[PDB]
Symmetry: C4
Subunit: 332 residues, 4 copies
């Protein structure tokens, strides 16, 4: 378990992306402005509350000493910046109750803390996770291709739909059905909606790939590294659901313009893993806090240049698609 | 004859592909699964029988000492893995009855063995081939451009249609009209169907090119190396025929995902030559058997990720096309 | 102020363009000609007068010693060639009345001289600018993204629309609403038109980028370097306005064919900054005059090859679009 | 005059093409053949006669010692192979009656000889050309952009239409209106047709460019090197005229497949300059004759692979377009 956690960190950081669907989106700007920078509002709503900011640190780690170190650093960045921080899968702490790598709330009482568990875990373990972590939301992840590429992975999936119904019926905090970089498909969103799920994380291809990661671990099956749908394609494919389900978007988000692009297409908020992980591995925590504060300023200036005074206003922004996104749209 | 056989092997392995149409197909996956890996069924039907697996070793060699060696190795892989193995053209053994390079059945009694002859050969030779080889099916190949690029090649083709009618009327095993990498066109499929042919191998461009090979042998006419239609284009062009004729697909199949892509478009099974030839030239036979067993596991996991419990289910999978395939579809 | 002016010159010249939308436009020529070269007329009309030529030197500099040097050289080229020369923003001279870097008219009495001020400056400063410079027109620039990327930049924009109304009502020379390389959007043109603006400079992306420049100065935010719409995209997006507002076009104009392409789409005239700046930095003033004279000859020969005897005739020329421009047109 | 002729040869051979529109055309082949190679007929009709073969050596040279050498070699290739050979512009021999570089008929009595003159020359000179050369046809070339890029070039074109009417009315051999690599436009074809012209050479962009050549000579104006329409685009744009005017096609023809592609779109015959010039500069005349004989064999084999027994049959061949040709077709 501990070695897998550290290999995930290692190989995620090693990965080099060669395609990012955000680069196939162009926004039509506004030459003549309407607003002052100081009036631009960054707030959004999802999972039963209003949030000051429209981006969050997405599920990564916990379950090893390196995970403990990373989680402490992420918790400090998140608390200081007033943003949501979701830990990696809590399963490691269920198997080893001595594990203190997820225990960041005690020292960070103002932290907005979410946590994460796999849909393969029975609802009893989800309940235990929520009871132990007291999170603001629970991500319930779906990672079929990752499990199948792992020698130690799950092989039976018949129970997952029944599990999802159980989580929806029993978990006392908001649940977010959570992809892991393969891009959540519309049929899955429909099924989740039917079970009562009202928030999803589309987490698509373009950034971290767990096919790449598990294939580095196994040394096999590289031909599957580009499995799934890109982040923008998953978001475009989900448009019919954008007002019935809260769409959180992640996967290859590098910068505030990528965030804005998600919001233009009706995302409620935008998650980052690799970008933030790399920052914490490269700079001091104080420096990372400065960068994240800078992201807020960048969001406001981009919105100002788009004549948008609120996050909701972004959905009115006109755009052009190119390349693969455009070719795919021709077929939809 | 023997030198041509060995040059075919040499130049086929030397060839480097720069375009593969499978890379212009994207499958829409399923984040929320339905099935257990152990319930995924790989069986298919064509040429009058049910097959345990949906891929086969396609026609290559025989007629030289190297061909004998390769055929023994392929027969061992095929028998061990329970898959169809089709020999190269049997004409060499008709011309030289001493040739034992095709005689793999005697030592491999559980082998599913097919064989191959050119449509230029009169039906009497086809009958002799079937009588001598006792195959489960007979591929009857069409290779006009290859013949024309060969100094020793055929120059008269008026008789080929009459030959095809003869084979259809007289051969007592199922016949498969077989392309050799130029991509079987729809008009040919229609004509074949009219004669009573019910199974074809579309074998398109993207993998081994016999224009490339014969042009290496002759040192001339490289400008024809990309003759014909790509494997995916031939398959898409054949869609109107997919339920009146059994479409077998080959040409540039590298891995199990390429196989799955063929099946998504209604192929009954998928043939491999170069990929398997390279494996047998690189690894021990035992190692190749392991790789092929691994392909079965990979097919099941890809199907699981696509929520497909049977081969037939794959035809329901949604997709996106890009690049040349997309541009061509715009014109169809 | 002086250091910013010189950094603008430095970084503008350092910039290397990797995309130019003019290269995605193809003109259908005429094999059989109609006209003599000596009868081709280059005249155009905008901002209340007829001009002998359809290109001009666009706003750049003034406000430093290097700016004084450059402005003297540009004034000599412009006067000798009978073309419009627009200075950079005059704000530096408003803040420092000792500044003589814009004072080129006194030595060049036949110069067609325009000047420039930011829309952030109250109309009283615009009036002072016009009174001091006696220009043939006043460009009023909009540069929101540039201001936001500058540490010393504007942060309040609520007043800009009211300013534009004031300038339209009060300035006694023609005004041109002026982009700075981000590509003026159609909604801005509509708003400007409503206020009484009748001439705009679309100045789009493809040549000098002030995102690139300010980001070089700050060392941050390179992910915004390609902000805005390309020159051709802005021109195509403005087609509904081409006969209600005079469209001047600039941004990445390299040569006379780029000029012709703008005119084919109904521009009244074409502005150049970087190309002319680089010429004056590379060659003697006498040599630059020769090159600019050569541009006139080139315009005539291109028009002759297109069977166009006047600038207006160019709007009848047929064309093909490719790449991004074509993909964007598919979406409009 | 002599130095210009030799510079044309030099720079034409130096040129490297980076785009060839023939590479954006794919032909749908026939897997099941109908015909014998020995029954495939290569004959065609244009300019008042039947021709044994559908390709010709297009206008190049004459007017210098090197031109005399090249013309003797081309005449020997053409006579031996039974194909049309068109000399370069005869104007040099009109200005210098001592010039013997075009005098190839006397030694080659079975030669099919055409000649060439510019439309700028009055009909009296065209008549003198035909009287002196006794050609089977007269190409009358249009090269406006080339003339304009030449320091010694024509500057007055008002007379060209009247000249064309004169040539049509007076010249006693068939006339071919002849482009020089810029791609003859449909409006020109219409005008020519109205004057009585019934054969044109579309000579488009993709091979030799006289913009490139004249710009190498002058050292200026490289930005015009890609002027005009590609060979395939000119041919596609001319489709409405293909049965009212005989379309000869040239420009970047490299090999027999390029020839076939022209014929698929209704060309009567296909011209080659650079390819044949390079052959004569690289190989012995005997070797070039072998290569050209080989082209005939290649045409037959390609036709056989397309189930075409005659040149006319090629117009029934199905195709796919890609890239720029496809994008342009989307706009037509
Ligand atoms: C090191 C590491 C570890 C994990 C992850 C990522 C990384 C980088 N991810 C997946 C993550 O939340 C996200 O879906 C993808 O990484 C895509 O986003 P980025 O491109 O990395 O921003 C993840 N997802 C999840 O739901 N539970 C988890 O425990 C983990 N573990
Ligand atoms: C060495 C070798 C030899 C042969 C072949 C191939 C190779 C590699 N192929 C063609 C083969 O069955 C298939 O159509 C193509 O090779 C395309 O598939 P791959 O891209 O190689 O998988 C072949 N086809 C056939 O019908 N009869 C034959 O005798 C042969 N001979
Ligand atoms: C050195 C320098 C300085 C300035 C500029 C440019 C350059 C190169 N530009 C912007 C200019 O007018 C034009 O909009 C862009 O440069 C795009 O055109 P080019 O691609 O450079 O031809 C400019 N624009 C403006 O309205 N007022 C100004 O003061 C300046 N300053
Ligand atoms: C050395 C040389 C000289 C000439 C030419 C070409 C070359 C290579 N070309 C143009 C020629 O006929 C043809 O239109 C173009 O060269 C395009 O065809 P290729 O791409 O070269 O096959 C030519 N055309 C013409 O009508 N009269 C001429 O005198 C000449 N001169």
């Amino acid at each position: 378990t501990t070695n897998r956690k550290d290999e995930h960190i290692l190989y995620a950081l090693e990965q080099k992306s060669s395609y990012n669907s955000f680069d196939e989106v162009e926004l039509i700007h506004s030459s003549l402005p309407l607003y002052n920078l100081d009036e631009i509002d960054l707030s959004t709503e999802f999972a039963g509350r209003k949030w000051d900011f429209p981006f969050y640190i997405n599920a990564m780690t916990g379950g090893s000493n390196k995970g403990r170190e990373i989680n402490q650093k992420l918790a400090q960045v998140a608390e200081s910046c007033g943003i949501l921080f979701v830990t990696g899968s809590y399963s490691a702490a269920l198997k080893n109750p001595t594990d203190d790598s997820f225990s960041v709330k005690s020292s960070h009482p103002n932290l907005l803390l979410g946590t994460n568990i796999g849909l393969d875990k029975p609802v009893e373990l989800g309940l235990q996770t929520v009871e132990e972590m007291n999170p603001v939301l629970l991500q319930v992840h779906v990672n079929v291709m990752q499990e199948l590429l792992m020698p130690e992975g799950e092989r039976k999936f018949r129970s997952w739909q029944s599990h999802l119904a159980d989580y929806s019926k029993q978990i006392p905090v908001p649940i977010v059905l959570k992809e892991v970089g393969f891009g959540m498909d519309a049929k899955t969103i429909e099924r989740a909606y039917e079970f009562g799920v009202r928030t999803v994380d589309l987490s698509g291809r373009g950034g971290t790939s767990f096919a790449y990661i598990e294939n580095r671990r196994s040394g096999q099956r590289d031909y599957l590294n580009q499995w799934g749908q890109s982040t923008m394609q998953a978001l475009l494919n989900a448009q019919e659901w954008k007002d019935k389900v809260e769409l959180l978007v992640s996967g290859g988000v590098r910068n505030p313009l990528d965030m804005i692009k998600c919001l233009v297409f009706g995302a409620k908020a935008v998650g980052l893993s690799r970008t933030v992980l790399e920052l914490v591995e490269t700079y001091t925590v104080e420096e990372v806090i400065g960068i994240v504060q800078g992201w807020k300023a960048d969001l406001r200036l981009i919105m100002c240049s788009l004549n948008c005074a609120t996050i909701a206003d972004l959905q009115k922004v006109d755009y052009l698609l190119y390349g693969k996104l455009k070719e795919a749209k021709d077929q939809m």
